[PDB]
Amino acid sequence: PFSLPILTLSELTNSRFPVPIDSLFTAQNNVLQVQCQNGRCTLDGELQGTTQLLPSGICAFRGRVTAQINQRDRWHMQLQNLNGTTYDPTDDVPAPLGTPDFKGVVFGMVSQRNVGNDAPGSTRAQQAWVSTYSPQFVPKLGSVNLRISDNDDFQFQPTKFTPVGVNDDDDGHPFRQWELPNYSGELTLNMNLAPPVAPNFPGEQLLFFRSFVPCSGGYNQGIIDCLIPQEWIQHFYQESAPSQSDVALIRYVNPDTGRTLFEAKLHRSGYITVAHSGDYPLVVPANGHFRFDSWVNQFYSLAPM
Amino acid sequence: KPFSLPILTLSELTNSRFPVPIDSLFTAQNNVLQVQCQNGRCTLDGELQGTTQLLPSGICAFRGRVTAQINQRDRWHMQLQNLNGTTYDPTDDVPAPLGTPDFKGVVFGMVSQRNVGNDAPGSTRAQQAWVSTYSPQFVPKLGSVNLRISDNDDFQFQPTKFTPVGVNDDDDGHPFRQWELPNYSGELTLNMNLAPPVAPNFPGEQLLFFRSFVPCSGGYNQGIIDCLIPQEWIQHFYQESAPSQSDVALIRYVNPDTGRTLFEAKLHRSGYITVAHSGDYPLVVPANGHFRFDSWVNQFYSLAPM
Numbered sequence: 141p142f143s144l145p146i147l148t149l150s151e152l153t154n155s156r157f158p159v160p161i162d163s164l165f166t167a168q169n170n171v172l173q174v175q176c177q178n179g180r181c182t183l184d185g186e187l188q189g190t191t192q193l194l195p196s197g198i199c200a201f202r203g204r205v206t207a208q209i210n211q212r213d214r215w216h217m218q219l220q221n222l223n224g225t226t227y228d229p230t231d232d233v234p235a236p237l238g239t240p241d242f243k244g245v246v247f248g249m250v251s252q253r254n255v256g257n258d259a260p261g262s263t264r265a266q267q268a269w270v271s272t273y274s275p276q277f278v279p280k281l282g283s284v285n286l287r288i289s290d291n292d293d294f295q296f297q298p299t300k301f302t303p304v305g306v307n308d309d310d311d312g313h314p315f316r317q318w319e320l321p322n323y324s325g326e327l328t329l330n331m332n333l334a335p336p337v338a339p340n341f342p343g344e345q346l347l348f349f350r351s352f353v354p355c356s357g358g359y360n361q362g363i364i365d366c367l368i369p370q371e372w373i374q375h376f377y378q379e380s381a382p383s384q385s386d387v388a389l390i391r392y393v394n395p396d397t398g399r400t401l402f403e404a405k406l407h408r409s410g411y412i413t414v415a416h417s418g419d420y421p422l423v424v425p426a427n428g429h430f431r432f433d434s435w436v437n438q439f440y441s442l443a444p445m
Numbered sequence: 446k447p448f449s450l451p452i453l454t455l456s457e458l459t460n461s462r463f464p465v466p467i468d469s470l471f472t473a474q475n476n477v478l479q480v481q482c483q484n485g486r487c488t489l490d491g492e493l494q495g496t497t498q499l500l501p502s503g504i505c506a507f508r509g510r511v512t513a514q515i516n517q518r519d520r521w522h523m524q525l526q527n528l529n530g531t532t533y534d535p536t537d538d539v540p541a542p543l544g545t546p547d548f549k550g551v552v553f554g555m556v557s558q559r560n561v562g563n564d565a566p567g568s569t570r571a572q573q574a575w576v577s578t579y580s581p582q583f584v585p586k587l588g589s590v591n592l593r594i595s596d597n598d599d600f601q602f603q604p605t606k607f608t609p610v611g612v613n614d615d616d617d618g619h620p621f622r623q624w625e626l627p628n629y630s631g632e633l634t635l636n637m638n639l640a641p642p643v644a645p646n647f648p649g650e651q652l653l654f655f656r657s658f659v660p661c662s663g664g665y666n667q668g669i670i671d672c673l674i675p676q677e678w679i680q681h682f683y684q685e686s687a688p689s690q691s692d693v694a695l696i697r698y699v700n701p702d703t704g705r706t707l708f709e710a711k712l713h714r715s716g717y718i719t720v721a722h723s724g725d726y727p728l729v730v731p732a733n734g735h736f737r738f739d740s741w742v743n744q745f746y747s748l749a750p751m
């Protein structure tokens with residue numbers, strides 16, 4: 141029988157950036173498509189897009205630095221899969237699993253640990269940035285280029301990128317959470333994408349699990365919204381409960397009082413809709429959580445949120 | 446009601462003592478020095494212990510406000526909150542705020558700030574930082590730690606988060622010692638409310654660890670951090686809260702392709718694993734393998750040699 145894990149918002153991890161969930165948010169419908177590639181999973185447990193299971197994999201890279209070029213995006217990083225295995229560009233994914241799914245700069249740290257004949261075991265780490273606007277951001281082809289703070293202490297050796305936050309670039313390239321990067325560079329279409337999501341019933345809007353992630357300068361709010369949290373993804377992967385219909389009715393409950401605060405539709409393809417009109421940050425008690433009620437269908441009419 | 450494990454390969458598991466994937470399994474020779482980590486501690490019926498909390502992103506992280514600086518290497522005084530942003534209570538029955546590092550060394554990563562109130566609200570900044578758990582100002586139980594940062598001219602008295610990236614030895618000699626607990630209340634104080642030490646005491650048995658090689662920031666340290674059970678098992682036991690039928694759950698490492706069992710192990714009620722083996726040994730196992738629950742046995746069950 142299908143179920144959700146029992147977890148409060150502060151016990152949940154954002155599936156599009158590795159931080160806790162801060163709040164719930166419903167957004168007004170708009171012509172601009174929602175088509176994130178991280179945090180995508182069906183209710184019967186099929187991961188989609190660039191989604192993988194580990195919070196520490198989200199927006200991370202692993203590989204070898206193999207060259208440098210005379211450009212701002214200086215250091216060429218040939219990618220592996222996050223578990224260290226060889227990346228195959230012909231696999232049926234948009235990019236290596238964990239790759240960022242938005243336009244912007246991800247900041248964090250790079251670390252290296254030498255192998256082979258040149259000082260094996262020697263290490264180093266420093267601040268780095270990955271711009272997903274860069275012409276050298278071509279993860280589907282098997283590489284990205286890094287900007288680092290100290291060009292004199294970086295070798296052609298195995299490298300990991302650990303994300304900390306996001307920002308706008310300079311030069312007029314803003315942080316746009318709903319714009320997909322070009323995974324294969326400038327004139328090539330993205331492939332094998334998880335499909336766009338949108339409400340289909342009148343009066344319905346998407347409900348998001350929202351985080352305010354760190355930024356590295358200026359005034360950006362750091363908003364990253366996901367469809368379902370990483371812990372639900374991990375749970376659906378395990379259970380693989382056959383979905384009885386296209387829509388699971390779920391209720392947000394206060395476990396202390398025992399009462400239901402509102403209801404929502406959890407769709408088979410892994411997103412939530414609510415009956416509401418307008419942008420609204422939800423105000424709900426800190427102990428609250430969703431519970432599965434019953435299988436319904438597309439025509440089920442939700443009580444207003 | 447019936448006990449179980451989540452079905453996950455090693456590359457699908459997260460270290461419960463540092464936020465990275467598991468790299469390998471390791472059994473260690475029995476030693477005089479005790480294992481008493483405070484992160485990654487959970488009973489099989491789902492009671493978290495020590496400084497253990499549920500989120501991989503909480504492990505070795507801090508959250509709070511920077512309130513002062515001092516004329517010492519550990520310069521910036523960070524008054525801590527709980528990781529969810531609520532007020533930290535020093536009289537709570539824990540060794541330290543949940544997520545606090547449980548080893549002697551330096552944790553390196555980044556600090557980030559986001560202003561609130563009257564001074565440029567919304568303005569942000571981030572840079573490299575280090576937290577030494579040897580520091581006399583590392584007093585998380587009392588409610589604060591002091592940070593070293595790379596740029597002392599761009600840091601304010603504002604809400605701050607520390608995100609860990611790796612570990613190292615300090616550069617004045619003080620080594621990275623994963624099995625030595627820090628003093629959570631500083632010099633001349635004893636730790637309280639600790640999760641107990643763990644050790645085998647069936648003859649021929651050794652602890653089995655889930656091992657990760659975490660990033661280091663210079664020199665040759667291997668970055669070894671061993672945990673007793675992975676974060677995903679902790680999360681699973683917390684959800685299930687299955688009553689434990691005996692002191693020991695017999696578990697089998699299986700290859701799901703071939704269908705065969707490769708070795709067996711004892712999963713103890715208090716949340717650690719023992720195997721029948723003599724000597725330090727990095728296990729060699731197929732990449733698709735995973736543990737499965739077999740049955741409830743007792744402390745004196747005799748394991749097939751591994």
Ligand SMILES: C[C@@H]1O[C@@H](O[C@@H]2[C@@H](O[C@H]3O[C@H](CO)[C@H](O)[C@H](O)[C@H]3O)[C@@H](O)[C@@H](CO)O[C@@H]2O)[C@@H](O)[C@H](O)[C@@H]1O
Pocket residue numbers: 356357358359568569570571599
């Ligand atoms: C709001 C403001 O944003 C950040 O500062 C940036 C500038 O960043 C540069 O200058 C600051 C010094 O104030 C600092 O030295 C930093 O390391 C350096 O990169 C800069 O990008 C300008 C661009 O014209 O905009 C901002 O002022 C941040 O560092 C500040 O603390 C502050 O939050």
Ligand SMILES: C[C@@H]1O[C@@H](O[C@@H]2[C@@H](O[C@H]3O[C@H](CO)[C@H](O)[C@H](O)[C@H]3O)[C@@H](O)[C@@H](CO)O[C@@H]2O)[C@@H](O)[C@H](O)[C@@H]1O
Pocket residue numbers: 262263264292293662663664665
């Ligand atoms: C093994 C070595 O570890 C790190 O180097 C440090 C030394 O750092 C100094 O040298 C490196 C380059 O070799 C670099 O230029 C650095 O900025 C500079 O501070 C130094 O601290 C010594 C002291 O005993 O230890 C290490 O050698 C690392 O930077 C290196 O890349 C290299 O892996």
